[PDB]
Symmetry: C3
Subunit: 186 residues, 3 copies
C-alpha cells in the first residue's frame, strides 16, 4: 500500500482511538507541534553528534518520549475505549529524569541572574530554537488538558523540557567557551 492513502485529502484525519476529526482540530495542532519539536531536536542532534558534544543520547531519549507524548495526545479521552487508555496514561518518570539532568548541568554553570540572548554557538543557538518550539508545543497542549482530553503529565513534561533545553544550551555554550550575552534596556 502506498504511503499516500488519500483518505486525508478532504481535510479529515484519524486519532489513535479511531475518532476522525478535521485536521485543524486542537488534537492535530498539538500532535503536529510536538512532531515539529522532535524534528527541530533531530536537527540539533546532528550538530551535537558532529561537533563532539556528548549529550546526544539524552536528546535521542527525549525524542522517544516525545513520540509517547504524540501518542497520548492522539488518544483523546473523550473518544477512548478501555483498551485505548493504555496510551493516554503518560507516566511521570521522564519528568524526574529531566530534573536530574537539569541539576547535573546546573552544578557546572554560573548562576543565572538576568535574561540572556539566545546565542552561544551553533549548537546552543539551535537548542534555544528547540526551546522556543517546545514552549509553543506546551501552549498547544494546555487547552487539551483543560478540556480533560489529555493527562496533565504531558504538559508538565513539556514545561520541564523547555527548562532542560535552556540549560543544555547554556551548557553547550560554556563548553565551547562562549560567554553568555546579557542585555538590559536603558
Amino acid at each position: 500500500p502506498k504511503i499516500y492513502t488519500k483518505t486525508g485529502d478532504k481535510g479529515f484525519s484519524s486519532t489513535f482511538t479511531g475518532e476522525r476529526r478535521p485536521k485543524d482540530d486542537q488534537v492535530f495542532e498539538a500532535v503536529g507541534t510536538t512532531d515539529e519539536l522532535s524534528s527541530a531536536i533531530g536537527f540539533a542532534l546532528e550538530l551535537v553528534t558532529e561537533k563532539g558534544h556528548t549529550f546526544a543520547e539524552e536528546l535521542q531519549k527525549i525524542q522517544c518520549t516525545l513520540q509517547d507524548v504524540g501518542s497520548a495526545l492522539a488518544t483523546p479521552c473523550s473518544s477512548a475505549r478501555e483498551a485505548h487508555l493504555k496510551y493516554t496514561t503518560f507516566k511521570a518518570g521522564p519528568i524526574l529524569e529531566l530534573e536530574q539532568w537539569i541539576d547535573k548541568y546546573t552544578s557546572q554553570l554560573p548562576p543565572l541572574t538576568a535574561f540572556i540572548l539566545p546565542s552561544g554557538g551553533k549548537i546552543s543557538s539551535a537548542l534555544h530554537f528547540c526551546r522556543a518550539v517546545c514552549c509553543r508545543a506546551e501552549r498547544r497542549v494546555v487547552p487539551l488538558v483543560q478540556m480533560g482530553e489529555t493527562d496533565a503529565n504531558v504538559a508538565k513534561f513539556l514545561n520541564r523540557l523547555s527548562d532542560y533545553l535552556f540549560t543544555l544550551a547554556r551548557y553547550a555554550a560554556m563548553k565551547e567557551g562562549n560567554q553568555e550575552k546579557i542585555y538590559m534596556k536603558n
Copy 2:
C-alpha cells in the same frame, strides 16, 4: 515607493483581490505558513546542494508550486484560484520512484538520518502545519481543494525523501525505543 510602504503599520494588509483584512486573518496565516515552509525547504536545499544529491531541482520546483499555493490562498473566492492537480500527480510519481529504491518501512523512525534528512523532517512538520492552516479555508469554500491535497501529498514526499537521502548517504536513522526510567510501563 520603497520596500516599506507602511500600509501594513496599523495591522491590516491586502489580499490579491485588493481586500483589506487584519494581518491575523486566516488568509494571512495560511499564506505566511506556506512561505515559512518554502523558506525551510530553501535552507534544506542549501544542504542538499553542498552534499551533491540528485533531487535539488525537485525541491526548487516544489518551491515554485508553493508560490502558486500562496497566490491561491491570497485570492479568496469570497472577494475574487484555479490550482490544477498536475503538481499532486507529479509528487506521487516522485514518491513512487524513491519508494522503489527503499525497503518497506518496518520500524518507527525518529526524525533523524543525517543533517539533510533531519532538515527534511523539519520541513515535513512545517508542511503539516501549513496543511492545518489551509484546511479551514477549503472547508469554507475560500480555497481550491487541490491546495490542501498538494500539501497533504507534500509531507509524504518530504518523509520519503528524508529516508531516501539517509540511504544514499549511508546514514543510520534512529528508531523508537521505549524510554521508561522509572519502570512504570506495563506493556
Copy 3:
C-alpha cells in the same frame, strides 16, 4: 533555586504586571513567537559570524530589541501600573534605524523583485526563514495592539523587521556571489 519552580505545571504563567493567565493566552503566544524569532536569528547569526560579516552586529542589536519587544508584550497595558511604563513604552527609534539599514543595502542591490524563491546560499536562506518567522510574530502581536494591550510601535517594528530580513538576505547572496533562484510557472 531550581529553574523548574513547577508553578507553570498546571498551565498558567505570570505576566510582568503580576497577572496569572493560561499559557495559551494571546500574550504568551506573542511573547513565545518573538522568542522563537530571536532564537532563529541567533542561529542565523552563527552562520554569519563564521563568515565574519559585519552585519552580525546588526543581528545582535536586533536580538536586543526583540528582548524589549518581549518585555513589552509581557507587560499588558490592561494591568500595567505607573512603574511598568519602562517596559510598555516602545519608541520609534528602532524602527527608523531599520529603515536606514534597509536604505543602505537597497542602494547596493539590483532592482527589487517579488519573484525570488527563498535561496541564495546558507546565510540568505536562513535569513528568509527568519523573515517568515518574523511575519508570524507580527500576526501574533497585531491582535494585542487592537485590544489596547501593546504599543502600536511594537507591531510596526516587526513589520519593518521582515523587510530588513528580506533585504539582508538579498545582500548576503550578493556578497557571496550567489545567484538567487527565480520562480518558474
